[PDB]
Amino acid sequence: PPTKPTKPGDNATPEKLAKYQADLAKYQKDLADY
Question: How far apart are the first and last CA of the chain?
Fold first, then answer.
């Protein structure tokens, strides 16, 4: 099972949240593959 993003997705800068969104995007992809 894909590793769930440990990065802050609640309280973080918009830029850093975007990075979280990119990771979460990867997670969704790998999750779908799972």
Answer: 6
Q: How was this structure determined?
A: NMR
Residue type (1 letter), 7: K
CA distance 20 to 12: 9
Per-position b or e across 3-18, b if 16+ CB within 10 A of its CB: eebeeeeeeeeeeebe
Q: Rounded to an integer, what distance in angstroms lies between the CA atom of residue 11 and that of residue 30? A: 25
24, 5 in Cβ contact below 8 A?
Answer: yes
Task: Report the SS3 class of residue 19.
Answer: helix
Find where tokens 């850093």 sit: 16
